[PDB]
Design a protein around this ligand. Structure first.
Ligand SMILES: *[C@@H](C)[C@H]1/C(=C/c2[nH]c(/C=C3N=C(/C=C4\NC(=O)C(CC)=C4C)C(C)=C\3CCC(=O)O)c(CCC(=O)O)c2C)NC(=O)[C@@H]1C
Ligand SMILES: *[C@@H](C)[C@H]1/C(=C/c2[nH]c(/C=C3N=C(/C=C4\NC(=O)C(CC)=C4C)C(C)=C\3CCC(=O)O)c(CCC(=O)O)c2C)NC(=O)[C@@H]1C
Ligand SMILES: *[C@@H](C)[C@H]1/C(=C/c2[nH]c(/C=C3N=C(/C=C4\NC(=O)C(CC)=C4C)C(C)=C\3CCC(=O)O)c(CCC(=O)O)c2C)NC(=O)[C@@H]1C
Ligand SMILES: *[C@H](C)[C@H]1/C(=C/c2[nH]c(/C=C3N=C(/C=C4\NC(=O)C(CC)=C4C)C(C)=C\3CCC(=O)O)c(CCC(=O)O)c2C)NC(=O)[C@@H]1C
Ligand SMILES: *[C@H](C)[C@H]1/C(=C/c2[nH]c(/C=C3N=C(/C=C4\NC(=O)C(CC)=C4C)C(C)=C\3CCC(=O)O)c(CCC(=O)O)c2C)NC(=O)[C@@H]1C
Ligand SMILES: *[C@H](C)[C@H]1/C(=C/c2[nH]c(/C=C3N=C(/C=C4\NC(=O)C(CC)=C4C)C(C)=C\3CCC(=O)O)c(CCC(=O)O)c2C)NC(=O)[C@@H]1C
Ligand SMILES: *[C@H](C)[C@H]1/C(=C/c2[nH]c(/C=C3N=C(/C=C4\NC(=O)C(CC)=C4C)C(C)=C\3CCC(=O)O)c(CCC(=O)O)c2C)NC(=O)[C@@H]1C
Ligand SMILES: *[C@H](C)[C@H]1/C(=C/c2[nH]c(/C=C3N=C(/C=C4\NC(=O)C(CC)=C4C)C(C)=C\3CCC(=O)O)c(CCC(=O)O)c2C)NC(=O)[C@@H]1C
Ligand SMILES: *[C@H](C)[C@H]1/C(=C/c2[nH]c(/C=C3N=C(/C=C4\NC(=O)C(CC)=C4C)C(C)=C\3CCC(=O)O)c(CCC(=O)O)c2C)NC(=O)[C@@H]1C
Ligand SMILES: *[C@H](C)[C@H]1/C(=C/c2[nH]c(/C=C3N=C(/C=C4\NC(=O)C(CC)=C4C)C(C)=C\3CCC(=O)O)c(CCC(=O)O)c2C)NC(=O)[C@@H]1C
Ligand SMILES: *[C@H](C)[C@H]1/C(=C/c2[nH]c(/C=C3N=C(/C=C4\NC(=O)C(CC)=C4C)C(C)=C\3CCC(=O)O)c(CCC(=O)O)c2C)NC(=O)[C@@H]1C
Ligand SMILES: *[C@H](C)[C@H]1/C(=C/c2[nH]c(/C=C3N=C(/C=C4\NC(=O)C(CC)=C4C)C(C)=C\3CCC(=O)O)c(CCC(=O)O)c2C)NC(=O)[C@@H]1C
Ligand SMILES: *[C@H](C)[C@H]1/C(=C/c2[nH]c(/C=C3N=C(/C=C4\NC(=O)C(CC)=C4C)C(C)=C\3CCC(=O)O)c(CCC(=O)O)c2C)NC(=O)[C@@H]1C
Lengths: 172, 194, 289, 162, 162, 172, 162, 172
């Protein structure tokens, strides 16, 4: 996997160039955002169970087909699997947030995920709907202004949103 | 519950060996070589030797063989099939304590000896808690199994011999016959002769 | 039709295009659009250099001295077409290409190979080309005045195997028949001979495992003969195609492409192991009932 | 690509775990270091020509047989001198990457892994490269955390070569 | 799925064997049981409404907070009461399947596997469902082999929950 | 795999329904045939080696091309595999008879078998001919009026015949 | 051991499960069978000498060369006749064990496992023992379930030898 | 492992003898007890969670040293391990009750268990105390006269008590 630093390095190496002064300044700007990045990971992680279970409740309320007998989330084993998938995606989104790069998400969560779901008959659009609900819950938690030093986290919240969107796009 | 923790111990397999192919290097039986029928025999025989030490006609698993021959399954799948077979359960599981069964599994599957009693103790509970298959799958899915033998190679006892020495460590099929004193007593052996 | 998977399959641009028809009393811009379409279709989206253009045939098309079909026929019989597609190819490869270029579909059966191989061998390339263009199928789909186009969508007279085989011949929009991983090799010789099909692997860019290709020998069969017995307790089996395996390195890694049959209960472990191999999932397909 | 951030995730992922305080502390450790690393990368980049030319010259001085013995592996002709200066440039450039990345990852991925086979195959002496890395260590002019980190990567390459 | 006939075949096939007297005896055991199982399934099916409602009321009596407290996991509102009655209906219906199949298969596959994850994630007390299962046991009205087999599956579910 | 009971259960659960009275009644009728079913399984099993070997001998007699040098069943390993395949099919037919559902036979024996034979050059039509011969021998053995409580086994025999016919059809 | 009670527990143990109605049904299957098997074992045992003698004579009659040809594997002399009567006695005795145990367990454990190697190594014809088993099938005079179970085991051994 | 039937066969085979008349009659007597034996296994199994949890609670009340900090059953893992052991031993006791022979319990559960507890520092005598508490609970559950065909289960109960004694003695 890459992180925000090694992403720049790998691009620089493929051209046999040192990082330009502007590239270095961009990474220095990334360093200055680090505390906010660490806070966002921390807030999502600390609320992960609530994020998953609330989003799951919302998804099933809006798509009762998923949980009625014969629906893809019916039976405990399929329900449990479904809840696990939600937590897995959230976990990897935080990994991407932590490293500041989508590679971990793409390589280790979304690799073959759509194929898996088709092979299994998991409704991909419904997974994407579930991911979208986690996104909204997560971003509100990240942006919460209570009990933290105040600042502009819009740059990171936008990055996190893109990681959720990437996951939702991949399962459809 | 997480597996009980235990420490390793110094072992040949734990250090770089600077190995160069010789008559003491275990033969690599892999399906990545596109083996002919007779050569597939040898690979199958090697697997029986590695897991059972010897497969009488009664012990053999002809359907698993056909599936391996046809590419339906990998060598690791064939090895799992042998570990799940009636012969393995009857010979090595039922005739031993859980602790000795674990030792057999580690020796046959990972190609190394156990570190200590504590390793045997920690894994002895797995059959009861995860079931017999859970134990085999854990070992076959382990980084140690996959790193050494992967999916397409028959496992073997690792780093048994060191260069220039007349003898190596005991072969596991000598060191670890299918049963030991516990079952020997039940059978009423040794037999007084003369 | 193809809607949800259109973009990842490289079909969306063709969904967005209409057949190129040359109307009676066509304008010059009409003629230019036909010429461009014919070059792109019939020459498999190869770049065409100004020195390679068929200027005379283009003039005759523009003048109405030859219809669209006769212009297609001329392009197909030109030294340009033959250099690109005949002189360096196994004839089964040639037949595959002709079908794609002139009929917009992949061969359905070994019978088509028999027919066209014999026709070429007995009467020559020109005769073979005519058989595609004068075919009933060509007439019904394109007639005299429409440039041939890819027939992704289901039509009367189709067979399912045609749909899967189109993605053995079509490898994406930014690609040509002469710039594909299998290079000069026939894509369908084995499929046709055995009447088998392969899991569909979409184009690069939109599919991480786009490069998956099986080897000559030592492949995993499509279906799980024997069921779950070799795997022990397992609910259902899946065939996973994996490409770009590198991480352990040789000799631990021999072939970077591998297909495995694994049980439902090990899919989590399988995906984890694949990722650590560096590999990319090309396709997953149920292997048992 | 060993860096504090990727290793923290890979560890957590191998355990199927969310990131916790342990990985957050790893991130804070990376943050404490990064700016000094980027400054060290900037300094080395700006002085790259001099460091590489001086490094190559220091090697020729210590191993004069390299500039006078005919052979594909030596620097007697301009061809070899260019190969040699290029190689030393690689070491320097990839070291700046390690400073940017905050780990030996770039050295491991781009240079270290397989270097033994290269040097043996083409008859290049590892001592030559050790000499160049010692020159860069003594002439890069860094101080403080920038020096310590940069020297750690320079030492890491030296250890691999010896 | 754990049932006598499938288990008999599963074992023999895993041993690559034709069925032998052991497996025939398993079939004879199934045959001895099957009619009582089918009769029990019918009885529970015919009284499903009373059993489920009675069981749901039994839980509400034993755990009054479940009908008085607000929250998604409780049954103070109609939404919650409908979820609860549905769930108890699941337990009962899948138990009838066990009687039809002659083993815990249906319970294991449809309900039990993963139940701990569900109850933890949605904050549902196992004790609630245990009480409902106890009511069904005391009220289904079965006797003899039908009763014994039916109570085993109910006790099987209860034990899985504790 | 499914047996006769869990086939109906599986269908019911998907629909979220209890088994109907007629479904329960039908299963009761199956239970009443249980003794005949067991007897037929036992009789085929007891004669398994003869059924296979006699069928193979008749096959090769009628199809000498199989056992000519270069034929598909020439050489010991190929003859062994052929005899093995016959025995596999007979075994799985008895499994299907025992369970009263074709799933075990379809999933574990027949799925992918045609493709294997085509790929290997095994003459599937010849396999089918051998299966037919085993069918004839097995049904006669099942129908033997002697040494058994006399009764009507026509329905079980038809069910068994259908399993054989499925096998023969499957291998082409 | 292939025996209904042993396999029920072996399977449950292999699965880490308490015994359930599936295993209890297997036990009922065993109980339905057991008396018939015990009665069969008694009848076979009481008639043991006659059955063995008759079986050996049947073999000698069908294969007269065995009583005429010199050789360690043949019964021309008294030694070989004694070996032969001993072997047949083993088959009958172990068959009675299967009737007591309710499965092929004893035959598998004591006789069948390795029988291929013995017969090949000592040049003993499997057809000799098949003839002797057919004699026992024909002359044990059992009826009903006793006959069926006993014939299943005799046929099981016949199948193993062919 | 042996069941009641194969225990006798194994002894006869080692002697080279047919089962005697009294041996066959003894096994006939065991068969006559079969229904009671199945009932006892069913009752213990149905109450397994209660037998374990109640026994564990009573053991920790009588021996509080086990659950004090530093006690062998202190910390969640060790407590869970302790509960797991009680359930395993109970389960293997039911296995022995089912087969009518101690071998399954001796071979799988008890063989080497003493040495394992010594190696780990598990207090063996406390385990035996726990096993005796399960024993008392189990026998009462087996002996309950309500909702069952009344009869004399004294023999089976004594057999079951013997299995619990075997387990208790093996660890203390
Ligand atoms: C958007 C994410 C929200 C937000 C965040 C935010 N945080 C800071 C500053 C700090 N946050 C931390 C974090 C931690 N300290 C710890 O010890 C741990 C636990 C292991 C964590 C997660 C730290 C160290 C700082 C710096 C010190 C401080 O007290 O501020 C800022 C300020 C920017 C900065 O780092 O200077 C911001 C903006 N603030 C919001 O308003 C959003 C809701
Ligand atoms: C001591 C254990 C107690 C006891 C037992 C007892 N049981 C019976 C008889 C039967 N018990 C059963 C059991 C089952 N039938 C089922 O369908 C199931 C589920 C699969 C079970 C567990 C059966 C079939 C019988 C026979 C028919 C009957 O209902 O009686 C008896 C009677 C004598 C006998 O041995 O058969 C006894 C004594 N009785 C007590 O008083 C003890 C508390
Ligand atoms: C068609 C298959 C033939 C046929 C069968 C048939 N059998 C019965 C009845 C029984 N068969 C058995 C079988 C066994 N008892 C054992 O102990 C074992 C050995 C392990 C076996 C295989 C049993 C128990 C019965 C019931 C009692 C009896 O002795 O009859 C019937 C009668 C119908 C019924 O369901 O009971 C029939 C029809 N009969 C034929 O004529 C066909 C050739
Ligand atoms: C929940 C919102 C939706 C849902 C989910 C669902 N998924 C499965 C099964 C699997 N999910 C995965 C996915 C992953 N496994 C991993 O290890 C990772 C990380 C790399 C991912 C992303 C896999 C592999 C499986 C199959 C293996 C397994 O053990 O589950 C199921 C179960 C399907 C079935 O039981 O047949 C379900 C139900 N289902 C919905 O309806 C929701 C939209
Ligand atoms: C060097 C100062 C001395 C010396 C060393 C020596 N050692 C060996 C062989 C082995 N050393 C080990 C050590 C370890 N195994 C472990 O797991 C660990 C911790 C990770 C350690 C330290 C092992 C297992 C071996 C055997 C395997 C192998 O050598 O590859 C040898 C070789 C012995 C031989 O006969 O080849 C030597 C020479 N020898 C001296 O004379 C020095 C005093
Ligand atoms: C005999 C009537 C005919 C015949 C048979 C034959 N088959 C093969 C090879 C294979 N047969 C199978 C079949 C199975 N394997 C399984 O696991 C199962 C499901 C449980 C079945 C049905 C397979 C997989 C193979 C290929 C692998 C193997 O060799 O075992 C051969 C051998 C061909 C070869 O050597 O390549 C033969 C001869 N052949 C005839 O001519 C008869 C008509
Ligand atoms: C209906 C019960 C389910 C369903 C169907 C569905 N199918 C498609 C698309 C195609 N179906 C085919 C099938 C065939 N083509 C053939 O040549 C043959 C035999 C002659 C068959 C059976 C093909 C090739 C396609 C794609 C091409 C085309 O449709 O023209 C779709 C649409 C897919 C999409 O829009 O992307 C659908 C919806 N879908 C369900 O959910 C039902 C369970
Ligand atoms: C130039 C910066 C580099 C380079 C380029 C190069 N490309 C080709 C050949 C092709 N390029 C394409 C790409 C497209 N075709 C399309 O229609 C589209 C838009 C949808 C794209 C992006 C294709 C398909 C080809 C193959 C077709 C053809 O006629 O070649 C070549 C030619 C290679 C050759 O002739 O062997 C080259 C040279 N090459 C470099 O070295 C530069 C880095
Ligand atoms: C004759 C000595 C042997 C023989 C030949 C044989 N070949 C086929 C079928 C085909 N042969 C080809 C060959 C070519 N296609 C090309 O493009 C070229 C190069 C220009 C060649 C040489 C092809 C593609 C086929 C398939 C189509 C067709 O059938 O014509 C057959 C028929 C096979 C069948 O099953 O129909 C035969 C008989 N067969 C022998 O036994 C001889 C040893
Ligand atoms: C050198 C002339 C060219 C070159 C080579 C190159 N290869 C790889 C990677 C691999 N090569 C193999 C090869 C084999 N596997 C086998 O089993 C056999 C036959 C027995 C062979 C020849 C494999 C499996 C790999 C992948 C695993 C590994 O890396 O060890 C690479 C590296 C690829 C990477 O992306 O890292 C390279 C560079 N590359 C060139 O440019 C030369 C033209
Ligand atoms: C009734 C005793 C008490 C109660 C029930 C209650 N349950 C839920 C939610 C769920 N119940 C289940 C259970 C199952 N789903 C299945 O598929 C099966 C197996 C076939 C079972 C047993 C599940 C999975 C859920 C969550 C998803 C869903 O709602 O379908 C609720 C609502 C919980 C929430 O947060 O929405 C309630 C109220 N609550 C009480 O207070 C009763 C005492
Ligand atoms: C001769 C010493 C005695 C003898 C021979 C005999 N053999 C058969 C039948 C078969 N023989 C074989 C042998 C082989 N087939 C092969 O492919 C190979 C390896 C290349 C060998 C060694 C086989 C397979 C058969 C059975 C199938 C077939 O018919 O080909 C018979 C007929 C048996 C039958 O039941 O039809 C006979 C008579 N018989 C004697 O009495 C001689 C002393
Ligand atoms: C509870 C009443 C008492 C208690 C128990 C306790 N045991 C352990 C650890 C282990 N127990 C076993 C048990 C077995 N091994 C076998 O093979 C079998 C048969 C299947 C059994 C029953 C094993 C192997 C272990 C070690 C491995 C593991 O626990 O996972 C512990 C934990 C010890 C530790 O250090 O964690 C405990 C607490 N302890 C008491 O104080 C009670 C008296």
């Amino acid at each position: 996997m890459f992180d925000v630093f090694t992403r720049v390095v790998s691009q620089a190496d493929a051209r046999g160039e040192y990082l330009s002064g502007s590239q270095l300044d961009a990474l220095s700007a990334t360093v200055a955002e680090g505390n906010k990045r660490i806070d966002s990971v921390n807030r999502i992680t600390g609320n992960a169970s609530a994020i998953v279970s609330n989003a799951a409740r919302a998804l099933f309320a809006e798509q009762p087909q998923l949980i009625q007998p014969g629906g893809n989330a019916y039976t405990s084993r399929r329900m449990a699997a479904c809840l696990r998938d939600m937590e897995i995606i959230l976990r990897y989104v935080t990994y991407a947030t932590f490293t500041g790069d989508a590679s971990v998400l793409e390589d280790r969560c979304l690799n073959g995920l759509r194929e898996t779901y088709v092979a299994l008959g998991v409704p991909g659009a419904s997974v994407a709907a579930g991911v979208q609900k986690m996104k909204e819950a997560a971003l509100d938690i990240v942006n919460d202004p209570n009990g933290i030093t105040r600042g502009d986290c819009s740059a990171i919240v936008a990055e996190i949103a893109g990681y959720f969107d990437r996951a939702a796009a991949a399962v459809a | 519950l997480p597996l009980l923790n235990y420490a390793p111990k110094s072992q040949n397999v734990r250090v770089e060996g600077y190995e160069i192919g010789s008559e003491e290097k275990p033969v690599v039986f892999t399906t990545e070589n596109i083996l002919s029928s007779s050569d597939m025999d040898n690979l199958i025989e090697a697997a029986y030797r590695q897991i059972f030490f010897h497969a009488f006609k009664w012990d053999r698993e002809k359907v698993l063989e056909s599936q391996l021959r046809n590419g339906q399954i990998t060598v690791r799948d064939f090895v799992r099939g042998l570990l799940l077979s009636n012969t393995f359960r009857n010979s090595f599981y039922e005739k031993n304590s859980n602790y000795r069964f674990v030792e057999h599994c580690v020796q046959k599957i990972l190609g190394r000896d156990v570190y200590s009693e504590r390793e045997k103790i920690a894994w002895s509970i797995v059959v009861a808690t995860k079931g017999y298959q859970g134990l085999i799958d854990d070992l076959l899915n382990s980084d140690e199994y996959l790193n050494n033998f992967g999916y397409d190679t028959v496992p073997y006892q690792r780093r048994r011999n060191l260069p220039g020495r007349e003898a190596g460590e005991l072969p596991f099929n000598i060191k670890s016959p299918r049963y030991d004193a516990y079952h020997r007593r039940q059978l009423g052996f040794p037999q007084i002769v003369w | 039709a193809i809607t949800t998977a259109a973009s990842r399959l490289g079909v969306a641009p063709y969904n967005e295009s209409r057949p190129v028809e040359l109307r009676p009393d066509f304008s010059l811009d009409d003629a230019k659009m036909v010429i461009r379409a014919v070059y792109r279709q019939v020459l498999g989206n190869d770049y065409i250099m100004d020195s390679e253009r068929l200027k005379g045939a283009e003039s005759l098309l523009t003048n109405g001295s030859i219809s669209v079909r006769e212009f297609v026929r001329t392009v197909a019989k030109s030294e340009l077409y033959k250099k690109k597609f005949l002189y360096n190819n196994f004839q089964t490869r040639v037949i595959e290409l002709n079908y794609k270029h002139l009929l917009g579909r992949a061969p359905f059966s070994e019978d088509e190979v028999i027919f066209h191989l014999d026709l070429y061998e007995n009467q020559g390339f020109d005769a073979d080309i005519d058989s595609y263009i004068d075919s009933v199928e060509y007439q019904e789909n394109f007639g005299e005045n429409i440039v041939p186009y890819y027939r992704f969508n289901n039509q009367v007279g189709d067979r399912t195997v045609g749909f899967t085989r189109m993605f053995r011949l079509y490898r994406g929009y930014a690609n040509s028949d002469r710039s594909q991983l299998e290079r000069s090799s026939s894509r369908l010789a084995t499929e046709l001979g055995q009447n088998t099909v392969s899991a569909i692997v979409g184009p690069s860019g939109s599919n991480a495992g786009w490069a998956y290709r099986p080897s000559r020998a030592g492949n995993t069969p499509a279906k799980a003969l024997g069921g779950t017995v070799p795997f022990g307790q397992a609910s259902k089996l899946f065939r996973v195609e994996i490409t770009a395996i590198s991480a352990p390195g040789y000799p631990k890694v021999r072939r970077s492409n591998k297909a495995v049959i694994v049980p439902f209960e090990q899919l989590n472990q399988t995906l984890q192991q694949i990722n650590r191999l560096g590999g990319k999932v090309a396709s997953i397909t149920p292997a048992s009932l | 690509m060993k860096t504090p951030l990727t290793e923290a995730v890979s560890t957590a992922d191998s355990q199927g775990r969310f990131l916790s305080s342990t990985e957050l502390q790893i991130a804070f450790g990376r943050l404490r270091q990064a700016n000094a690393g980027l400054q060290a990368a900037k300094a080395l980049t700006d002085n790259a020509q001099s460091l590489v030319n001086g490094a190559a010259q220091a090697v020729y001085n210590k191993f004069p047989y390299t500039t006078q013995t005919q052979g594909n592996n030596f620097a007697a002709d301009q061809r070899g001198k260019d190969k040699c200066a290029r190689d030393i440039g690689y070491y320097l450039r990839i070291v700046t990457y390690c400073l940017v990345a905050g780990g030996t990852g770039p050295l491991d991925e781009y240079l270290i892994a397989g270097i033994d086979e290269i040097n043996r195959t083409f008859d290049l002496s590892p001592s030559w490269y050790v000499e160049a890395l010692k020159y860069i260590k003594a002439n890069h002019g860094l101080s403080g955390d920038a020096r310590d980190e940069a020297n750690s990567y320079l030492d890491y390459a030296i250890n691999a070569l010896s």
